[PDB]
Design a protein around this ligand. Sequence first.
Ligand code: OOO
Length: 447
Amino acid sequence: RIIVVALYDYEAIHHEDLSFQKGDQMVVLEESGEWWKARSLATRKEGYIPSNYVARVDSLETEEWFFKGISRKDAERQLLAPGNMLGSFMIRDSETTKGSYSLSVRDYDPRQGDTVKHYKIRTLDNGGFYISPRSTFSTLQELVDHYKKGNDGLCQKLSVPCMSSKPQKPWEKDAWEIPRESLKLEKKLGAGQFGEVWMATYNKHTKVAVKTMKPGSMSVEAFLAEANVMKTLQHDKLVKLHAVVTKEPIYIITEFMAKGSLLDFLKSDEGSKQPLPKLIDFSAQIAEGMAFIEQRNYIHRDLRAANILVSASLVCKIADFGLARVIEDNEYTAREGAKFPIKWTAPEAINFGSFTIKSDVWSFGILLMEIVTYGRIPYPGMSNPEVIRALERGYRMPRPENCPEELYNIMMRCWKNRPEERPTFEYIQSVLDDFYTATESQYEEIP
Ligand SMILES: CCOC(=O)[C@H](CC(C)C)N[C@H]1CC[C@H](n2cc(-c3ccc(Oc4ccccc4)cc3)c3c(N)ncnc32)CC1
């Protein structure tokens, strides 16, 4: 038997769904994707449940201060989000010590501003936990209640758990290739060379975005083969593909991103006021998404601020990854103008059609410049032939005002003419993740 407990709760959307409200317990036969086969005790009702709305009975996942499955970097971002207070905290699984735990606490000092401090929660051999040897606990709940009463060596006294919203409902099972009539297109968000993007409702009860490709732009079989790879590229910094309509005009259904593209955002009243540390955090988020793409031996092929999306909570998500590969070159698409932008494209991709993760790295450098200039066109004052000929002679965009030199150094490494000399996204991810926390210890060595 495998017994579980509901963390959040939500009611029916699909066929024979269950209706709990907040706190309830149940048993599950076995797992089927992310919709587990659910059996309830004090309900007599049988159905399916969202797997991300439940957790094991006597596991930490039931606790409001435990954040399962998040990274150190995402712990810092979550805690520094608006709505959290001094001493806001979470306990999470440790990244550098398997089976152990880490405490992350929101701190403030006038010198460094808003920071997050991390503490190693060590496990005792015969049960229990401690941060400092003089203060041991039987449970993590006892550790929390202790440090809620006084800092006792921590940077702050613990106040409230990090804020968190109910996660997105998992996509309906057996709903990969969906009928076009299941979608109501409600608001056109944009028009492009090869298609449009709509805000839409799926089956009357789910908000999504739909990219509607122009007729003649893709073939069903080639797109589906590629889309079946795209849908497996699941990462918090890539936009999620939910479903496709595999008939011309092909529709691509993804999660809806309230703030549009990063280009739109940086050029908006709100985005143009983001401070430089937030711009660098955007850069780190995209680099994390690209390091995942790199790890998966995939190629974006059209990386630019216009192809980064921004959530309501300012999460950057890579969009259109791989899509350029399945846009056909024929009489229909030719009428629409340039397929890829010269100013973003690595020279070997322009000259020989050699698109690799290394030509993505080049494009990422251009994107970094877009970010720090709040969406300025690359190579201002220069035509496309001028850019190509200048690059061949070692010209690179000069460092703009309000650009840290180390960020520019990353750009210059991305813009090596020889692709092999360009860094990995794994390397870029590490430098950007640790941009300001250089010359600092990873964990606080509390006495
Ligand atoms: C020049 C165009 O510029 C415009 O018109 C406007 C101008 C503004 C100022 C009005 N900006 C555009 C910017 C982009 C924006 N857009 C595009 C997508 C999307 C991207 C890829 C995708 O498919 C994928 C395919 C493969 C992999 C992953 C996803 C599905 C949806 C998307 C989304 N899911 N949620 C919100 N906005 C979203 C629409 C408006």
